[PDB]
Amino acid sequence: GKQGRRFDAQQYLVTSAQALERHYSRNGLYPASQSLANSPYYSFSYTPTADKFGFSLKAVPTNRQSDPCGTLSLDHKGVRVPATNCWSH
Numbered sequence: 001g002k003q004g005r006r007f008d009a010q011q012y013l014v015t016s017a018q019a020l021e022r023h024y025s026r027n028g029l030y031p032a033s034q035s036l037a038n039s040p041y042y043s044f045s046y047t048p049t050a051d052k053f054g055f056s057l058k059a060v061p062t063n064r065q066s067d068p069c070g071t072l073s074l075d076h077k078g079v080r081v082p083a084t085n086c087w088s089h
Contacts, residue, residue, distance in 0.1 A: 006067050009042045009059040010089040013074045016046070016057055020076070030055050030076065041065040
């Protein structure tokens with residue numbers, strides 16, 4: 001349940017990273033912004049690097065999501081955080 005909602009957030013981070021790669025493929029750079037939909041359980045953010053060659057997607061749990069993995073992140077290299085024990089997507 002709580003676990004299920006963590007995996008939901010992971011699935012959305014991944015869908016979002018796939019969209020970012022489509023923009024990168026057409027433009028050679030990541031975009032300045034990306035509209036993301038928050039939930040009662042996670043707040044999502046997209047942060048490109050200054051040179052727009054990298055990014056970080058984050059899902060930050062709300063107080064209503066008492067999950068041991070805390071904030072989840074996913075970058076332009078596919079690196080998932082927390083690095084162990086937490087990601088299944």
